Design a protein around this ligand. Structure first.
Ligand code: CLA
Ligand code: CLA
Ligand code: CLA
Ligand code: CLA
Ligand code: CLA
Ligand code: CLA
Ligand code: CLA
Ligand code: CLA
Ligand SMILES: CC1=C(/C=C/C(C)=C/C=C/C(C)=C/C=C/C=C(C)/C=C/C=C(C)/C=C/C2=C(C)CCCC2(C)C)C(C)(C)CCC1
Ligand SMILES: CC1=C(/C=C/C(C)=C/C=C/C(C)=C\C=C\C=C(C)\C=C\C=C(C)\C=C\C2=C(C)CCCC2(C)C)C(C)(C)CCC1
Ligand SMILES: CC1=C(C/C=C(\C)CCC[C@H](C)CCC[C@H](C)CCCC(C)C)C(=O)c2ccccc2C1=O
Lengths: 106, 164, 107, 731, 64, 41, 51, 32, 80, 26
């Protein structure tokens, strides 16, 4: 939809890349914790089911944050050597916040 | 007894396996009336079977640890101990027929190249020609070794090469 | 599927010798052959086999048995079509003889 | 744009094969940009330091993990019932039943049973304690760092060798025969006689007391006087116990033959006289070639002067020396031919003559060590022809090679390939035809109608070596012959007691199942050479393509024209042989393993009944022996075979993934990627992401290699899973 | 004069890279000009492209 | 019917006649000579 | 804390340090990793069947 | 003794990820 | 950039030019044939190497000849 | 840490010789 694609932060050109990666970070923050916290190796432990799965999911955010910075050094107002480094920074800080936001939402 | 072996008329695992097979045929034979053709067939199977064991012991076939007819494919151990019929007779009974088919097929290809278009007569085999070479090729070693002495068997270095 | 289906149920096609199901034991080896025979065609290519024919047309040139219909290797699409035809024939007749030697005995 | 620093023609490639060909022709030094022949030899020479520094780091890794995570000090005391340990396991993906099922061998945590058998090799060279194994690990780790630093320094411009230093074939072959082969074996007999002989007699000769222990009680006095039989006076007896002094004996160079009675290994004393004897010969053969002192042989006058008269071999070997010395692929092709045959010779002589103590009792060790050095021999032997085929393109010069034996090879090259194609076709007709004949006779219930040709020509040889099971009474089974009577005190009674024992692998008794399979091996040897010698000879051209040398060794094709030229290159003629190689080594290892399973179980008649027909290969060796393998994990539970059960399905998966690169070819896939490029460039919010190297499908030559690698890795991992788990499952 | 063989004589090809090397065919015409490869030879043996004819030079071509 | 005898003299038709000849000869011999493993007299 | 490329390269690498050097001792969960447990009942038998 | 629970996540998660990265950023350098 | 080099065994029947799907080949005068023409490859920068030229040359041991060199974005046949 | 610090204090002099090798070669 041409209406909806102009809303979500991948196409908001009029936003700074720090706040852009922050909203993308939290949006994938309290969401990818879902499979680890429900059906990982610790479904049937009713105290570690929210601890280790969220701590693993924060590890996956750490991998994806490196995976973003690797792309910026490869590929090169976000598509820049600096705007992407602010983008991956906001994804790491925004992603770690959202995974802690996932554990808060218990 | 040539190479750790024994005659099949003398070994006992051979006779044990003969009695093993005839046991399996007879317990299969028991399900039928003595007039019935499913029993006439099985008793005819036995008399082909029992004559087969009689004929293998008659020829002096060599059994071993497993009681099976072992073959000796060496002249000088088959000529000396009476076993040329195992390998040494059919190694020339074959090579008569083998070079026969080779020579008939050779003479058909040689005698077709001097024509208009010889590729047509490899589809459409000239049957009055091909059968004529088929009958008269029966002395093919007598004809080949005469062709071997000339130099007409081997074509010279007119043959096709790449980069010698 | 390896243990309980292809290995446990194969014990009626592999020891069916000396019985009426022994023809299914042969085609079980027969189609295991023809299947693998197809991999000569599915993997290799024509420009190998044409050069190998030239080396044996040479020994047929030398003994004056050079044929008039000249030996060529199978075409590119043909060597594939020979390959998938022997893959399917060797593949299906394996399962044919596996199924029937199983199910005639135990059923 | 920067990664292929060697090939700038790949640096201008905007596609993703830039990555794939940056990897695969990075060690093709002859085709790099700006490469010269002085620059050629220096990178090869430093890379050989790189191979050596890896090997010694690898071996120091084996010494470390055995010394730390293994039970070598526990295995010394009981070397039969205690199973060896390779390295302990830390896989955090495990479960609790998968921890306790892999704890074995008396260890604490999960462990791997070492089937490589480096315990038996280390136990007989004197290793007894773990502290002796850490010292060996720290030693080789130092030596591996020496070869790392050496390959760095011999690239530095002060220390770069001259171009004429490498072409001195006189001085290398004079130093490697005498020093690298002779002095090394002379020093290894120094390790045997000083250390490894008295360690078996229960006497610790360490680095502290090796200058105090005499190896022989009257040492160095027979060597300086002459009575060298004083070194063989009181040997290890027939009631010796290995590792102790119980019936020890004092000889250091005995010449017995046969085996030790306990270990069923070779005696340590004649292994000392062995490596002493060839050390003397390699040093003497290391004084043959004329380097700098006016004496010796020139290689430039031995080749060229051996031309037979009446034109038997053209112009003889005239002019080969400048085509061996200048060409590297000729030197590499000879070396892979030599090493690849003396890799089989390692494998053929270690199951029958096991050289290490309590080997040929550990059965999984014997299965791994034979099968390893047969596939290692198989790959090296087909690379000899591969780099032999690269020789005819990159290095062959017909003007330099007018009329020698190398050009007469290319002259009658169709007579070579057509006579190989007759032998391969005759064997395949009459080996398969006999098995199918036997299979039908099994199917019709009549095993007596089989074709069972007794192996006369090999049983005649075993009887000539002293096997009186067949009664040829010929030479060493003949007790009134000459060769029996020239050695009754010299070397025979140990050897003749060792063959006529029915329970070792020294000259196994053979029947018609062994007739058929050696011809099948002969089929596989003659057909694999048919593919390879055709790949060497027709590397320069055929009638289909008379300028194959202009493209190079590894090209895809020459188009669909002239009838179609799929797989025309000599690379593509080499790769077809790897299928027929793995087939052939698959046939030698099926036959080795199954004749040894029926030997070690005891049912030695279960082979000879069933090996004569191909169903017995299937329902008695593959079906029957994979019972405990595939039961490595089931819904009832799991056991120690589950890591080999998992790999056995892992091997089938890589194998079948190999057919995807072999049946599907490139151009189905390039069109499929063009849809993926579209669906990536038109997807919203993924247009943020764009590639740097353009996604293209894997090239034609690459698809051969990637598919052959998946074929071969899955081939190896399948059989090694079946080999280790069928042996160790029942043993 | 008229260089090359006659109009329809048998001939033997000596070009080592040609498909009909050491092989016998019929000359059909020899072009009388400064062409590098005047001699046109027809064969019964067709090549891998199905082309039964080729031009050859004066020196790669020998009678009978 | 001269054209019909050319068809009978093509390659696959002579192949399927001669193979019924040669198999049918070996079938009748292996009927009247049951199981010849070795050349007797 | 981090905003450029090389600051993020340090923080990912140091966070990989801070997890793994603890995971060997404090982070091996009692229910997750059965290797980081005690030696349980048996298992140290021969390979079975024969030798 | 604490070694096999530390060196294995280094070589298998961490040191390969450095080699996944540094041997990737090297690939697409634009050559000066 | 593939390497297309043609030879003097050309007869100038211009079937290679008509078969070239990328206009790599064109016909230049040359006196060594009856048709007074010999091909030329001024546009090997655009060549993919699909070898439709040398499927079409009549001459034995093909006169046109394509050597697969280093592949740019035009030699790999890319719309992307 | 006896043989650890002794190997480390040996590696100090080994690295100092490596600073001699890293300069005298080029
Ligand atoms: C690979 C070839 C080969 C091998 C290893 C043997 C091996 C043997 N032959 Mg022999 N043989 C062969 C080919 C071979 N034969 C051929 C082709 C012929 C000619 C037809 C003979 C003719 C022959 C004779 C005539 C005799 C042997 C004998 C022997 C034995 C001594 C030994 C078992 C001799 C024997 O029985 O032992 C003394 C003997 O008398 N062979
Ligand atoms: C025995 C192991 C070994 C050794 C000694 C070397 C040695 C070398 N490699 Mg190599 N390499 C190896 C394995 C090895 N490589 C493997 C397994 C790969 C992956 C396929 C590579 C991939 C590779 C690349 C991609 C490059 C080298 C390069 C080099 C040179 C620096 C040096 C000659 C470089 C080179 O030769 O450039 C001049 C280079 O660019 N290597
Ligand atoms: C006497 C002096 C001497 C010695 C000892 C050596 C030693 C060596 N040179 Mg060398 N070299 C010398 C003089 C010498 N060189 C001179 C004067 C020249 C100039 C003319 C050269 C030029 C030269 C080149 C150009 C190269 C070498 C290489 C090598 C290495 C051989 C590779 C290897 O380890 O395989 C040794 C192989 C074996 C030990 C196995 C074969 C032995 C037997 C027959 C096999 C079966 C028995 C087996 C050992 C049993 C195993 C049991 C157990 C161990 C498992 C080796 C370190 C190569 C290398 O790696 O570079 C460093 C290389 O590329 N040299
Ligand atoms: C072919 C020669 C050869 C080989 C391969 C070995 C191999 C071995 N010996 Mg041995 N040895 C040899 C000759 C050899 N020896 C000779 C001739 C003697 C008589 C003096 C000894 C006396 C001896 C003793 C007394 C002991 C060994 C031990 C060992 C083992 C560990 C080595 C060790 O402790 O490192 C440590 C090495 C040292 C402390 C000094 C090594 C001397 C120099 C550095 C070697 C030079 C070689 C050179 C660096 C290699 C070439 C690469 C470069 C060019 C290993 C099995 C030990 C063991 O476990 O056996 C039970 C042990 O206790 N050996
Ligand atoms: C290159 C290998 C090598 C090396 C370094 C040594 C080194 C040594 N040997 Mg020795 N030795 C060797 C090979 C070697 N040996 C071989 C091959 C034999 C068998 C013929 C012997 C037999 C031997 C005896 C019998 C004696 C020595 C002795 C000695 C020592 C003093 C020699 C003066 C010295 C440690 C003497 C000694 O003092 O023992 C430690 C001694 O008595 N050696
Ligand atoms: C002494 C050993 C030796 C040496 C020095 C060489 C050296 C060379 N070979 Mg040669 N070769 C050898 C043995 C050797 N070879 C053997 C034994 C074979 C037969 C298998 C071959 C077959 C061979 C061919 C067919 C070709 C060469 C080529 C080359 C040259 C380029 C190097 C290259 O492509 O590396 C790069 C190598 C790689 C990138 C490795 C590719 C991947 C392999 C298959 C390993 C895959 C293993 C897999 C990943 C296992 C992991 C599984 C996982 C589940 C655990 C170079 C001169 C090429 C050449 O000269 O071109 C004209 C060439 O075409 N070689
Ligand atoms: C099981 C699979 C298989 C089989 C049977 C073969 C068989 C053969 N390959 Mg191989 N090959 C294979 C897989 C296989 N390959 C694979 C996977 C590759 C990798 C691509 C290769 C690559 C390869 C190369 C590169 C070469 C061979 C060659 C050969 C021939 C070796 C000579 C020989 O033994 O003749 C014996 C052949 C047989 C016994 C098969 C015939 C079966 C019977 C006898 C025919 C009659 C039965 C029946 C009447 C027919 C029924 C049809 C119809 C009437 C219904 C033979 C045809 C070489 C060659 O041509 O040598 C001459 C050669 O150069 N192959
Ligand atoms: C060889 C190295 C290696 C190691 C040590 C591990 C270790 C682990 N894997 Mg694993 N894995 C590997 C390779 C490896 N994997 C590979 C190659 C694959 C692909 C086939 C997988 C696929 C795989 C799957 C599919 C799963 C695992 C899981 C697990 C965990 C086992 C369950 C328990 O702990 C459970 C402990 C926790 C949940 C606590 C969280 C611990 C995390 C890992 C800390 C975060 C680390 C750090 C912040 C980020 C990494 C640094 C960065 C530089 C990469 C454990 C952390 C399971 C899991 O839950 O993943 C964590 C799981 O679902 N693995
Ligand atoms: C392609 C080519 C190549 C390659 C080749 C090859 C690969 C080869 C191989 C080869 C081989 C692989 C060979 C083998 C050989 C062997 C032999 C020849 C053997 C012999 C033996 C003997 C002589 C023995 C004797 C004896 C006996 C009888 C027993 C007992 C002891 C005695 C000693 C007495 C090259 C590179 C050159 C290049 C060119 C071409
Ligand atoms: C006695 C015997 C034996 C042995 C054998 C031998 C040892 C042989 C040798 C052989 C040899 C050493 C051979 C060689 C050869 C050569 C040649 C060279 C040949 C040729 C041939 C030909 C040439 C022919 C042709 C033809 C004709 C003429 C007719 C038919 C058709 C054709 C065309 C094919 C055995 C025991 C095994 C078995 C039994 C028998
Ligand atoms: C083996 C193989 C060949 C060689 C196969 C040859 C050319 C044909 C096989 C034999 C044919 C069927 C002739 C046999 C029967 C003839 C009718 C002659 C009959 C004579 C008597 C038997 C009656 C290819 O040409 C080929 C081409 C492309 C990819 C792979 C391959 C490939 O794998």
């Amino acid at each position: 939809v041409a209406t909806y694609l102009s809303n979500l932060p991948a196409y908001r050109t009029g936003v700074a890349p720090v706040l852009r990666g922050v909203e993308i970070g939290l949006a994938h923050g309290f969401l990818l914790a879902g499979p680890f916290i429900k059906l990982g190796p610790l479904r049937n432990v009713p105290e570690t089911a929210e601890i280790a799965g969220s701590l693993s999911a924060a590890g996956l955010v750490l991998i994806l944050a490196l995976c973003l910075s690797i792309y910026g050094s490869a590929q090169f107002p976000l598509f820049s050597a600096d705007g992407w480094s602010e983008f991956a920074a906001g994804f790491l800080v925004g992603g770690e916040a959202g995974v802690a936001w996932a554990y808060v939402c218990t | 007894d040539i190479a750790g072996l024994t005659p099949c008329s003398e070994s006992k695992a051979y006779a044990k396996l003969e009695k093993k097979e005839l046991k399996t045929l007879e317990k299969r034979l028991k399900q039928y009336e003595a007039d019935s053709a499913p029993a006439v067939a099985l008793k005819a199977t036995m008399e082909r079977t029992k004559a087969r064991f009689a004929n293998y012991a008659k020829a002096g076939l060599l059994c071993g640890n497993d009681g099976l007819p072992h073959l000796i494919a060496d002249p000088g151990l088959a000529l000396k101990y009476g076993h040329a019929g195992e390998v040494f007779i059919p190694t020339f009974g074959f090579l008569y027929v083998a070079g026969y088919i080779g020579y008939v097929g050779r003479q058909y290809l040689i005698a077709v190249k001097g024509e208009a278009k010889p590729t047509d007569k490899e589809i459409i085999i000239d049957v009055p020609l091909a059968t004529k070479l088929a009958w008269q090729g029966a002395g093919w070693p007598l004809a080949a070794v005469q062709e071997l002495q000339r130099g007409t068997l081997l074509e010279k270095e007119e043959n096709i090469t790449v980069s010698p | 599927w390896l243990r309980d289906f292809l290995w446990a149920q194969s014990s009626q096609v592999i020891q069916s010798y000396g019985s009426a199901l022994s023809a299914y034991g042969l085609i079980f080896l027969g189609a295991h052959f023809v299947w693998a025979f197809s991999l000569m065609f599915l993997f290799s290519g024509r420009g190998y086999w044409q050069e190998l024919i030239e080396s044996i047309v040479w020994a047929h040139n030398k003994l004056k048995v050079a044929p008039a219909i000249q030996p060529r290797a199978l075409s590119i699409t043909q060597g594939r079509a020979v390959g998938v035809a022997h893959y399917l024939l060797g593949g299906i007749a394996t399962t044919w003889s596996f199924f029937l030697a199983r199910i005639i005995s135990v059923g | 744009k920067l990664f292929p620093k060697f090939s700038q023609g790949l640096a201008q490639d905007p596609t993703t094969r830039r990555i794939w060909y940056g990897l695969a022709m990075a060690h093709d030094f002859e085709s790099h940009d700006g490469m010269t022949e002085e620059n050629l030899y220096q990178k090869i020479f430093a890379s050989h330091f790189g191979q050596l520094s890896i090997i010694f780091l690898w071996t120091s890794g084996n010494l470390f993990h055995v010394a730390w995570q293994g039970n070598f000090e526990q295995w010394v005391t009981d070397p039969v019932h205690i199973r060896p340990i390779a390295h302990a396991i830390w896989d955090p993906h495990f479960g609790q039943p998968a921890v306790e099922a892999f704890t074995r061998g008396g260890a604490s945590g999960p462990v791997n049973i070492s089937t490589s058998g480096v315990y038996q090799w280390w136990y007989t060279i004197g290793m007894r304690t773990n502290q002796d194994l850490y010292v060996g690990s720290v030693f080789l780790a130092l030596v591996s760092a020496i070869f790392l630093f050496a390959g760095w320094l011999h690239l530095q411009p002060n220390f770069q060798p001259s171009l004429s230093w490498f072409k001195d074939a006189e001085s290398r072959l004079n130093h490697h025969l005498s020093g690298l082969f002779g002095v090394s074996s002379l020093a290894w007999t120094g390790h045997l006689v000083h250390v490894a002989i008295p360690e078996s007699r229960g006497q610790h000769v360490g680095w502290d007391n090796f200058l105090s222990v005499l190896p022989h009680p009257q040492g160095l006095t027979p060597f300086f006087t002459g009575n060298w039989a004083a070194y063989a006076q009181s040997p290890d007896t027939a009631s010796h116990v290995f590792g102790t002094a119980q019936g020890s004996g004092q000889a250091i160079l005995t010449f017995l033959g046969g085996f030790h009675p306990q270990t069923q290994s070779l005696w340590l004393t004649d292994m000392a006289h062995h490596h002493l004897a060839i050390a003397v010969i390699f040093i003497v053969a290391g004084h043959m070639y004329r380097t700098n002192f006016g004496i010796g042989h020139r290689m430039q006058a031995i080749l060229e002067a051996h031309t037979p008269p009446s034109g038997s071999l053209g112009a003889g070997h005239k002019g080969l020396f400048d085509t061996v010395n200048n060409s590297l692929h000729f030197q590499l092709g000879l070396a892979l031919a030599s090493v690849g045959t003396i890799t089989s010779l390692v494998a053929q002589h270690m199951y029958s003559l096991p050289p290490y103590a309590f080997q040929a009792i550990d059965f999984t060790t014997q299965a791994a060590l034979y099968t390893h050095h047969q596939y290692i021999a198989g790959f090296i032997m087909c690379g000899a022809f591969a780099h032999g085929a690269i020789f005819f393109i990159r290095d062959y010069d017909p003007e330099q090679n007018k009329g020698n034996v190398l050009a007469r090879m290319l002259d009658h090259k169709e007579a070579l390939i057509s006579h190989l194609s007759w032998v391969s076709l005759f064997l395949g007709f009459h080996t398969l035809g006999l098995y199918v004949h036997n299979d039908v006779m099994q199917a019709f219930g009549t095993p007596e109608k089989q074709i069972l040709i007794e192996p006369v020509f090999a049983q005649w040889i075993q009887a000539a070596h002293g096997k009186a099971l067949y009664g040829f009474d010929f030479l060493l089974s003949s007790k009134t012959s000459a060769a029996f009577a020239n050695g009754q005190s010299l070397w025979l009674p140990g050897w003749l007691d060792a063959i006529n024992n029915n329970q070792n692998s020294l000259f196994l008794t053979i029947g018609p199942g062994d007739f058929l399979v050696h011809h099948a091996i002969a089929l596989g040897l003659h057909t694999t050479t048919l593919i390879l010698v055709k790949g060497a000879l027709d590397a320069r051209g055929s009638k289909l393509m008379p300028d194959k040398k202009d493209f190079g060794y590894s090209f895809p094709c020459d188009g669909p024209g002239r009838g179609g030229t799929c797989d025309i290159s000599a690379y593509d003629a080499f790769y077809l042989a790897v299928f027929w190689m793995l087939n052939t080594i698959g046939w030698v290892t099926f036959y080795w393993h199954w004749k040894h399973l029926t030997l070690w179980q005891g049912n030695v008649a279960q082979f000879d009944e069933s090996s004569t027909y191909l169903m017995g290969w299937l329902r008695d060796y593959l079906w029957l022996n994979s019972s405990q393998l595939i039961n490595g994990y089931n819904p009832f539970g799991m056991n120690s075979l589950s890591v080999w059960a998992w790999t056995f399905l892992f091997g089938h998966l890589i194998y079948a993934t190999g057919f995807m690169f072999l049946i599907s070819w490139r151009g189905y896939w390039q069109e499929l990627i063009e849809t993926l490029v579209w669906a990536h460039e038109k997807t919203p919010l993924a247009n943020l992401v764009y590639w740097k190297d353009k996604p293209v499908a894997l090239s034609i030559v690459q698809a051969r290699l990637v598919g052959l690698a998946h074929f071969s890795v899955g081939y190896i991992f399948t059989y090694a899973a079946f080999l280790i788990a069928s042996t160790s499952g029942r043993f | 004069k008229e260089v090359g063989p006659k109009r329809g004589s048998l001939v033997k090809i000596l070009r080592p890279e040609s498909y009909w090397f050491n092989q016998v065919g019929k000359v059909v015409s020899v072009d009388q000009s400064g062409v590098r490869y005047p001699v046109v030879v027809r064969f019964e043996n067709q090549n891998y492209a199905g082309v039964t004819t080729n031009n050859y030079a004066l020196d790669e071509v020998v009678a009978a | 019917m001269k054209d019909f005898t050319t068809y009978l003299s093509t390659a696959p038709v002579i192949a399927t006649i001669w193979f019924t000849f040669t198999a049918g000869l070996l079938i009748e011999i292996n009927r009247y000579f049951p199981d010849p493993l070795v050349f007797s007299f | 804390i981090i905003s450029r490329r090389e600051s993020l390269r340090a923080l990912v690498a140091l966070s990989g340090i801070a997890a793994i050097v603890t995971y060997g001792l404090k982070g091996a969960k009692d229910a997750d990793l059965p290797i980081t447990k005690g030696p349980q009942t048996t298992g140290e038998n021969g390979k079975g069947g024969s030798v | 003794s604490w070694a096999p629970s530390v060196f294995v996540p280094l070589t298998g998660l961490v040191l390969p990820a450095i080699a996944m990265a540094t041997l990737f950023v090297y690939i697409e350098k634009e050559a000066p | 950039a593939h390497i297309v080099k043609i030879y003097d065994t050309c007869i100038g029947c211009t079937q290679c030019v008509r078969a070239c799907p990328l206009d790599v080949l064109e016909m230049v005068p040359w006196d060594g044939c009856k048709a007074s023409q010999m091909a030329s490859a001024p546009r090997t920068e655009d060549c993919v190497g699909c070898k439709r030229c040398e499927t079409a040359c009549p001459t034995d041991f093909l006169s046109v000849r394509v050597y697969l060199g280093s592949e740019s974005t035009r030699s790999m046949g890319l719309s992307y | 840490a006896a043989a650890a610090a002794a190997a480390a204090a040996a590696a100090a002099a080994a690295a100092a010789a490596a600073a001699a090798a890293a300069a005298a070669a080029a």
